[PDB]
Design an enzyme around this catalytic site. Structure first.
Site, PDB file in Angstrom:
ATOM      1  N   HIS A 177       0.885  -1.213  -0.017  1.00  0.00           N
ATOM      2  CA  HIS A 177      -0.061  -0.021   0.039  1.00  0.00           C
ATOM      3  C   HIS A 177       0.882   1.307   0.096  1.00  0.00           C
ATOM      4  O   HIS A 177       0.375   2.251   0.795  1.00  0.00           O
ATOM      5  CB  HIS A 177      -0.959  -0.156   1.017  1.00  0.00           C
ATOM      6  N   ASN A 205     -10.143  -2.808   3.557  1.00  0.00           N
ATOM      7  CA  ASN A 205     -10.092  -2.673   2.183  1.00  0.00           C
ATOM      8  C   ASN A 205     -11.455  -2.586   1.461  1.00  0.00           C
ATOM      9  O   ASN A 205     -12.599  -2.518   2.142  1.00  0.00           O
ATOM     10  CB  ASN A 205      -9.480  -4.321   1.728  1.00  0.00           C
ATOM     11  N   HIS A 226     -12.631 -16.678  -4.412  1.00  0.00           N
ATOM     12  CA  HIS A 226     -13.464 -15.732  -4.129  1.00  0.00           C
ATOM     13  C   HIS A 226     -13.041 -14.290  -4.487  1.00  0.00           C
ATOM     14  O   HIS A 226     -13.496 -13.527  -4.894  1.00  0.00           O
ATOM     15  CB  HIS A 226     -13.734 -15.881  -2.758  1.00  0.00           C
ATOM     16  N   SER A 250     -13.955  -8.710 -11.485  1.00  0.00           N
ATOM     17  CA  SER A 250     -15.148  -8.243 -11.923  1.00  0.00           C
ATOM     18  C   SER A 250     -14.915  -6.504 -12.041  1.00  0.00           C
ATOM     19  O   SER A 250     -13.701  -6.155 -12.224  1.00  0.00           O
ATOM     20  CB  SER A 250     -16.086  -8.408 -10.899  1.00  0.00           C
ATOM     21  N   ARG A 264     -15.770  -4.263 -10.254  1.00  0.00           N
ATOM     22  CA  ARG A 264     -15.204  -3.355  -9.225  1.00  0.00           C
ATOM     23  C   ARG A 264     -13.766  -3.613  -8.864  1.00  0.00           C
ATOM     24  O   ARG A 264     -13.363  -2.911  -7.866  1.00  0.00           O
ATOM     25  CB  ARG A 264     -16.058  -3.665  -7.867  1.00  0.00           C
ATOM     26  N   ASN A 288     -16.668   0.865  -1.850  1.00  0.00           N
ATOM     27  CA  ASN A 288     -17.158   0.576  -0.595  1.00  0.00           C
ATOM     28  C   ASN A 288     -15.611   0.153   0.465  1.00  0.00           C
ATOM     29  O   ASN A 288     -14.935   0.140  -0.107  1.00  0.00           O
ATOM     30  CB  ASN A 288     -18.008  -0.751  -0.305  1.00  0.00           C
ATOM     31  N   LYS A 295     -20.251   1.606   3.461  1.00  0.00           N
ATOM     32  CA  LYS A 295     -20.628   1.639   1.882  1.00  0.00           C
ATOM     33  C   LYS A 295     -20.676   3.067   1.453  1.00  0.00           C
ATOM     34  O   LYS A 295     -21.079   4.041   2.172  1.00  0.00           O
ATOM     35  CB  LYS A 295     -21.944   0.872   1.756  1.00  0.00           C
ATOM     36  N   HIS A 346     -26.223 -11.557   3.725  1.00  0.00           N
ATOM     37  CA  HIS A 346     -27.058 -10.375   4.166  1.00  0.00           C
ATOM     38  C   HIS A 346     -28.641 -10.790   4.738  1.00  0.00           C
ATOM     39  O   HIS A 346     -29.137 -10.348   5.801  1.00  0.00           O
ATOM     40  CB  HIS A 346     -27.538  -9.451   3.037  1.00  0.00           C
ATOM     41  N   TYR A 378       2.157  -4.693  12.270  1.00  0.00           N
ATOM     42  CA  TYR A 378       1.960  -3.218  11.793  1.00  0.00           C
ATOM     43  C   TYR A 378       2.797  -2.563  12.614  1.00  0.00           C
ATOM     44  O   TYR A 378       3.625  -1.967  12.135  1.00  0.00           O
ATOM     45  CB  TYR A 378       0.588  -3.040  11.738  1.00  0.00           C
TER      46      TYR A 378
HETATM   47  C1  HEM Z   1      -1.441 -11.611   7.744  1.00  0.00           C
HETATM   48  C2  HEM Z   1      -2.125 -10.449   7.033  1.00  0.00           C
HETATM   49  C3  HEM Z   1      -1.516  -9.143   6.894  1.00  0.00           C
HETATM   50  C4  HEM Z   1      -0.257  -8.434   6.868  1.00  0.00           C
HETATM   51  C5  HEM Z   1       0.953  -9.198   7.417  1.00  0.00           C
HETATM   52  C6  HEM Z   1      -0.381  -7.370   6.638  1.00  0.00           C
HETATM   53  C7  HEM Z   1       0.874  -6.608   6.593  1.00  0.00           C
HETATM   54  C8  HEM Z   1       0.871  -5.162   6.290  1.00  0.00           C
HETATM   55  C9  HEM Z   1       2.061  -4.394   6.309  1.00  0.00           C
HETATM   56  C10 HEM Z   1       3.269  -4.574   6.932  1.00  0.00           C
HETATM   57  C11 HEM Z   1       1.772  -3.116   5.825  1.00  0.00           C
HETATM   58  C12 HEM Z   1       2.500  -1.781   5.784  1.00  0.00           C
HETATM   59  C13 HEM Z   1       2.043  -1.021   6.827  1.00  0.00           C
HETATM   60  C14 HEM Z   1       3.316   0.388   6.876  1.00  0.00           C
HETATM   61  O1  HEM Z   1       4.424   0.058   6.854  1.00  0.00           O
HETATM   62  O2  HEM Z   1       2.766   1.793   6.982  1.00  0.00           O
HETATM   63  C15 HEM Z   1       0.253  -3.086   5.536  1.00  0.00           C
HETATM   64  C16 HEM Z   1      -0.413  -2.091   5.258  1.00  0.00           C
HETATM   65  C17 HEM Z   1      -1.809  -2.328   5.054  1.00  0.00           C
HETATM   66  N1  HEM Z   1      -2.751  -3.387   5.101  1.00  0.00           N
HETATM   67 FE1  HEM Z   1      -2.107  -5.200   5.497  1.00  0.00          FE
HETATM   68  N2  HEM Z   1      -1.454  -6.932   6.030  1.00  0.00           N
HETATM   69  C18 HEM Z   1      -2.244  -7.926   6.247  1.00  0.00           C
HETATM   70  C19 HEM Z   1      -3.831  -8.166   5.705  1.00  0.00           C
HETATM   71  C20 HEM Z   1      -4.485  -6.959   5.305  1.00  0.00           C
HETATM   72  C21 HEM Z   1      -5.854  -7.138   5.286  1.00  0.00           C
HETATM   73  C22 HEM Z   1      -6.746  -8.190   5.559  1.00  0.00           C
HETATM   74  C23 HEM Z   1      -6.416  -5.761   5.107  1.00  0.00           C
HETATM   75  C24 HEM Z   1      -7.828  -5.192   4.826  1.00  0.00           C
HETATM   76  C25 HEM Z   1      -8.861  -5.845   5.232  1.00  0.00           C
HETATM   77  C26 HEM Z   1      -5.154  -5.034   5.048  1.00  0.00           C
HETATM   78  C27 HEM Z   1      -5.003  -3.739   4.627  1.00  0.00           C
HETATM   79  C28 HEM Z   1      -3.857  -2.797   4.796  1.00  0.00           C
HETATM   80  C29 HEM Z   1      -4.084  -1.412   4.221  1.00  0.00           C
HETATM   81  C30 HEM Z   1      -5.185  -0.598   4.043  1.00  0.00           C
HETATM   82  C31 HEM Z   1      -2.815  -1.057   4.547  1.00  0.00           C
HETATM   83  C32 HEM Z   1      -2.047   0.332   4.229  1.00  0.00           C
HETATM   84  C33 HEM Z   1      -2.337   1.187   5.560  1.00  0.00           C
HETATM   85  C34 HEM Z   1      -1.969   2.582   5.253  1.00  0.00           C
HETATM   86  O3  HEM Z   1      -2.814   3.306   4.836  1.00  0.00           O
HETATM   87  O4  HEM Z   1      -0.883   3.194   5.688  1.00  0.00           O
HETATM   88  N3  HEM Z   1      -4.032  -5.664   5.176  1.00  0.00           N
HETATM   89  N4  HEM Z   1      -0.312  -4.485   5.857  1.00  0.00           N
END
Ligand code: HEM
Lengths: 497, 497, 497, 497
Positions: D71, D144, D190, D197, D199, D209, D233, D301, D354
């Site tokens: 990200h 997400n 899934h 799709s 989206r 969303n 949403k 739902h 994190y």
């Molecule tokens: C085992 C599962 C996951 C791991 C190990 C993981 C790990 C990480 C890591 C290391 C970052 C970098 C954050 C940073 O350095 O600033 C990150 C960012 C992010 N992850 Fe995950 N993640 C996981 C699952 C998911 C899931 C399931 C979602 C959403 C439902 C998600 C959404 C995000 C988002 C949105 C960011 C960016 C946050 C920002 O805006 O700075 N991640 N994740």
């Protein structure tokens, strides 16, 4: 008990009548319990969802920053600088604008060669650094308790410090390394004589002088330039420990100077230093018998009398030592308008070395640390984004210069003083310069007979551990300074062997 | 002189008959002159094109890394572990495969609370860490000179270490902090009694025992699991300094243990420890009177006799201290197949804490540092790119798992031992567990009358500086252990006041 | 498919007939299973004793290092430099010793302003950096695909790069910032004209020239010095993309130059450049119509013809991109004996900037990274201990100079060339120097009519987004270069508005 | 022009009528001139005493921090969360205390796999992270634009991200890596179907969303616990780009989502999302046909209707992007009282990952960065000294717990919810769980015929680049979901080949 011992009880007493704050995580979430960890029953393994544990521990694992490569062990205090005399004819600095002007200061005392945890009461040069928070940005007078230093070229500094510190294999102090360097570099005789005199082990930080040590350049409003040496002499008077007392205090209280300064300020006995200058004109600099920018030489008081400027008072102790004393950074390059560098090679090397090491030790944005911030001035520039940025980062202002959107403009009145320098651009040898004249003067004019005897016994006591050839090379240099100096050391060395 | 003092002369002698190497920059460019800097004539300002200067200085400015948050002051040595007995029935570890098998080891000795530069000969727990370079990766037995510790929950460790170290305002050692913590946490009585006994100040690192301290889990090839405690007792015999001798050595030689270990190995007198284990079955663990995973308890020798395994010999001194001793990292999580963690909460906290702090101190790729590398094993995985990567970074191998390109596959024989744990997932209180039984046993069975008197005078000498209420709370805990223990301390405290 | 697409299949095929390696932790401990985590039953929380998980994840969390502040997006290749002509009369460099001598090289191609992940086929100066692994240490020719640059003073570089990159509030490319800077700094007209010509968007990295851009100083064995400009022209011939093709490739393949260079080297079509120099004597430098050290000027071929030296061939692709291309560091200060800096202000600023940023990006000991190491030379010096030290740290050698133990000595034949410089030490203005003469020459001699039209449409297309006053200031500068140049742009701008 | 383009002109206009600020160094010293450097005359070498130069340059050299490992490319905005419905029966969170309560929020939108500088309008999951500044510390909903993810075990995440990103040798996107992973891990069907799709490429960040995706645990004041899924949403409605439009925008404006969000907020059209929850009781969780904590499954739902809570409005754009958006850190572990983690393995892995990566990226004291600070709460704890500490460091408060000096105490009402978990502590396989049921439901109920055709052409377009065996393995998984799904892809692939 002394005020230093009653820190916790005083904290409790000043915060009496209010309930304890809520224990939170770093993110401000209230902690339910911080004495037990989450387990799978009474005798089960630890869970990852123990976020309170892993936060606490993670922060504990990252507490240590790198110690200063030199002057690691230190003591910190705060106060003000009060102008008592008018030197506006010499300098246009806002710190010296008018009489009775108080500038806040931060000071750090230190021992050059000791690590964090080493004894205070040991034979070593004492650091005496002063940070003036002037309206024209910070001024950092990074001084010593001696008006001179061991070397006159900055490329030898890393060598000198390596020789003074531990052996790279054994990790032990090596008198072999110390005296090999000093015997091969005979421009250290002057500083060595001062170091092994009585003022080598001052009684705390209140009973020692402070010197800029370098020649600086004062520029007035008219644009005329002179040369300067800063002196700040103790108002409590010079006072020293004997070798035996120092040796006792080394095991009794290794934090003698921290305790002494804390108790002095806590009880109200504020220590003070009187700020003096010597002035040298450009014609006097050209007609000086020695190099006036040589860091191993002094300006004699008869030829260059001290001119009073003001006094330095320390009245406030640090609240938190790590935040105010460990993280404080002193840059010799931080000089306000009116104060400039001289051609002194050592000073030239310090202009690079300090900001470089600060970026390593503290980080890129070390000037955002409160104690380092020029809070009595407004900073505006085209320096943006680095690690650990704790400002607005100058918001949405244009980040390039020149521009057409009213961003900060250069002030033409803050230009440097121009000078014409002669000679080729190359490496000039200064090892073969005068090394003994002022050393002889100090030995036979300043010191008395019992002071000469103690000086010789202190040198002989340290130098006896060196190899025979190093002892001979050292004694030869001492003999070239003065035959009685060399002969007395040699007699004591022969006794020791 | 001793071998330690003659490091430089030995270096010169072993490199006699060859000319000195060419002095180069970091980039290998030959240096023309490194005694003078480039100036605009003899008395001119320094040039930026002095690349030799700025390289040297820049490297000097970045020499310091963060010291260990605990066990900063340390001493390092190398040797081997020789198997003398067969324990293959207990563990399937390659380190214990067959009799006469030699595994190379690295050891580091240390003092828990002292900073880098602090005195060696002081009252403190001694660290005794052992790194076995096994064919199944590194094994790090990170032990102490005591079989127990002060606390039994890992969330209190940062608190304990903060209390043992300097006051956050004054930067001084605070007996108030130390005894407040110890008086509020009475599960420290056992470790406190050991610490203030004669074995608090061992005579160097050769004359002290070593213990894992934790219960570990041994798994055999058949898949049966037992519980273990590692002991490594000195073959030179236990030997301690008196308080007076220790106090003298603190000023005389603050690097007594570094000097002692260097001279011992240099002269050929290799120190050795005999490796023992205690074994505890799962039924014995369930029917143990105490918690067998409690770090403040021991397993009595009558019920659980020592079983010999092998011997630890240290024969090689470090070449460079910084590279081999300062940068060595010991991870309790580094356990080869056959050795696993037990439910001991403290051990569970150590599994997280060490790799975390190593990434901060040394850097992300600290396992690429030679002393930390598992050089007697082949590492292959899907871990790629970080700062300061000094391998091929596993070349062009697929960097995701699972894959269809023959990348490294998981070995199903290296699975962990499965166990069913009962109870809820929450925080269980262990502060109210037995704190005095084994302490009483130690006091009235192990110590004689003159040892009891010295123990009481040592405690009273340290505890006299604390406030009255803290003295009362401490003496109460000592009285609850044994009335003579408490009464003797109280009598000495009343004398001191 | 192309060789680039078949990397994984080629890896599998070259490692066919051997079983997959054992998946291990970083510490070499075999992993039992790396597809599932340890839970308290099937639907239970994760355990801390999942050391395999936390190791993998911890390393994944620390994969990113800081991208280069400029030239972030890049492509890397390896090969050799073959000497074809004798220039020993000009330089005493070992890289130019004798004819047929092959020095290994590392090259990196790049786009100045793009971030990591930006499109390759865009209008921007291309970086062309060459690292020669000479016997006298590394030589880093850090060049561009243009013989000039936008600015002539190094204090404006951070401003220039800030203007070329994103807006600090919006994080968008701002034509307002770009053309404000360029319109206020009219010494950029020459580089701007080159950039908006056809050679602004070269067809990959094989079809572009390379230039040192700076005046360098060649010193022979006799001690005579001359001035030099390095040219390395493509043997594949200059070839450019149209704006439409470039715009298509930007969405189709943003990694066009990485793919092109990988496929070229993989298929055996090794690209080559012919190494040329121009020579300028000190009397010619004094009698040059312009400043010969001005980075916005070139040396005309009629007055200063190209002298062939050798050829650069790239034959080897990187094994791992991160290890060989992301972590490669090029220091312009890395110059072997025979090659020195000239008074060019820009070059003087580069001598500081690069080693500083390398210490931040890669770390203090970045020269221990394999690709950065001077492996064909022997490094010996008094530089010791920093973070992530992966050598013996020069073992137990004395760490101070001068010494008496046969440590590395300075080589007096590697001294710099001395020169007498006239004038005061101050800030001299160079903004008001000639800005249009060579620009006019290029416009009306080199470019034909259709090339002039395309140049004007490219400038007008980019400059239309700027505010009216910035358009007027830019068109004024273009009119001062040549009235047809200014009038054509103005006509197109009026059409666009 | 649009508000985004007029950032500089708006800055100038809002600061009209005041003179430009004085350009200073970092230390606040006024700069005399910042367009020229100090030289030894007009054509002389640069001086070291050019402190203005070396400060500016040194800061420029340290501007880059490491990008997020995932990200990286992102867009940031600020606003508030308004409670519209009472859910106090479910949760005791202060964020949900009473109706009409406004909590300030910070949001970041992103693309998972793109680097900094990559195109916005590409097929990828979009990040939607929300930071609630609650009175009980920060709450970070790191969501997400999809209610599910590709994998269900956190040990596969580094593998998944490595497959999605560049090849380690070539540094190119590898469809071979992507589809090998996806074909070997059929629990991704899934999320793959959702991604390919319509989206997959939303029209900006306003028309998508947001989902928590994980099951969370709501605890009320009475102590009862339920399970939750967060939905937010769009109120602007779902709106997507065609493949052709997205491909055009990729070259036209790679910063489409940054521009869209900036212009939307600047013009006053504040985007809004409606905050929903689903509730699942513990008995419903035990009797759910699937694993309710499985991240690849949704709650239908009809069985679990959406319950409105409040709305999210974004009204304020970032002042400085680096300070507010690049440096913002979202920790899923940051959960206030009333909100807890569920046994979802993925969520358990995020609780560690994190804070670990934040300490690397931003630094140990990243929570002192203004955007990360819990400014609407009071933080008090025993966490002290690390690098770049910009607080009082909690002054002179006792730094150990428990203590006897009224330091912060644990709040027993903030304890976690206790639960009994059954089964052994080991690795349980979840690869063989249901992978096709909900995928079939989505395919044959939600999508219409033309949506099914576009889905198949999008998959076939991406999957055609993979090797034949990977295509077969992928098509097999699609056939097992639904025969029409598999057959249509296969037909298109045969056409493409
Ligand atoms: C085992 C599962 C996951 C791991 C190990 C993981 C790990 C990480 C890591 C290391 C970052 C970098 C954050 C940073 O350095 O600033 C990150 C960012 C992010 N992850 Fe995950 N993640 C996981 C699952 C998911 C899931 C399931 C979602 C959403 C439902 C998600 C959404 C995000 C988002 C949105 C960011 C960016 C946050 C920002 O805006 O700075 N991640 N994740």
């Amino acid at each position: 008990r002394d005020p230093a011992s009653d820190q916790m009880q005083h904290w409790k007493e000043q915060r009496a009548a209010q309930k304890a704050d809520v224990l939170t995580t770093g993110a401000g979430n209230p902690v339910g319990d911080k004495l037990n960890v989450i387990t799978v029953g009474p005798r089960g393994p630890l869970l990852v969802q123990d976020v309170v544990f892993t936060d606490e521990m993670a922060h504990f694992d990252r507490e240590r920053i790198p110690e200063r490569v030199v002057h690691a062990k230190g003591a910190g205090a705060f106060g003000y600088f009060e102008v008592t005399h008018d030197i506006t004819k010499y300098s246009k600095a806002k710190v010296f604008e008018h009489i009775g002007k108080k500038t806040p200061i931060a000071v750090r005392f230190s021992t050059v060669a000791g690590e964090s945890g080493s004894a205070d009461t040991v034979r070593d040069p004492r650091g005496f650094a002063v940070k003036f928070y002037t309206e024209d940005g910070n001024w950092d007078l990074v001084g010593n308790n001696t008006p001179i230093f061991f070397i006159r070229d900055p490329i030898l500094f890393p060598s000198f410090i390596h020789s003074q510190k531990r052996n790279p294999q054994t990790h032990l102090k090596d008198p072999d390394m110390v005296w090999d360097f000093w015997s091969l570099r005979p421009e250290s005789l002057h500083q060595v004589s001062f170091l092994f005199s009585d003022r080598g082990i001052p009684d705390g930080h209140r009973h020692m002088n402070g010197y800029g040590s370098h020649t600086f350049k004062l520029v007035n409003a008219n644009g005329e330039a002179v040369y300067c040496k800063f002196h700040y002499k103790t108002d409590q008077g010079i006072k020293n420990l004997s070798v035996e007392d120092a040796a006792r205090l080394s095991q009794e209280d290794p934090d003698y100077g921290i305790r002494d300064l804390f108790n002095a300020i806590a009880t109200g006995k504020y220590p003070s230093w009187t700020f003096y200058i010597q002035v040298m004109t450009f014609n006097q600099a050209e007609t000086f018998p020695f190099n006036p920018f040589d860091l191993t030489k002094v300006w004699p008081h008869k030829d260059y009398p001290l001119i009073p400027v003001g006094k330095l008072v320390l009245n406030r102790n640090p609240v938190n030592y790590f935040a105010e004393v460990e993280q404080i950074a002193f840059d010799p390059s931080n000089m306000p308008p009116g104060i400039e560098a001289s051609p002194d090679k050592m000073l030239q090397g310090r202009l690079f070395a300090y900001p470089d090491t600060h970026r390593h030790r503290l980080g890129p944005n070390y000037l955002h640390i409160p104690v380092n911030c020029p809070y009595r001035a407004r900073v505006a520039n085209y320096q943006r984004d680095g690690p650990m940025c704790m400002q607005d980062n100058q918001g949405g202002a244009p980040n390039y210069y020149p521009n057409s959107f009213g961003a900060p403009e250069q002030q033409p009145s803050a230009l440097e003083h121009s000078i014409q320098y002669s000679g080729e651009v190359r490496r000039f040898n200064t090892a073969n310069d005068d090394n003994v004249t002022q050393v002889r003067a100090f030995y036979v004019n300043v010191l008395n007979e019992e002071q000469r005897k103690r000086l010789c016994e202190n040198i002989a006591g340290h130098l006896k551990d060196a190899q025979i050839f190093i002892q001979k090379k050292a004694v030869k240099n001492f003999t070239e300074v003065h035959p009685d100096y060399g002969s007395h050391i040699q007699a004591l060395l022969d006794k020791y062997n």
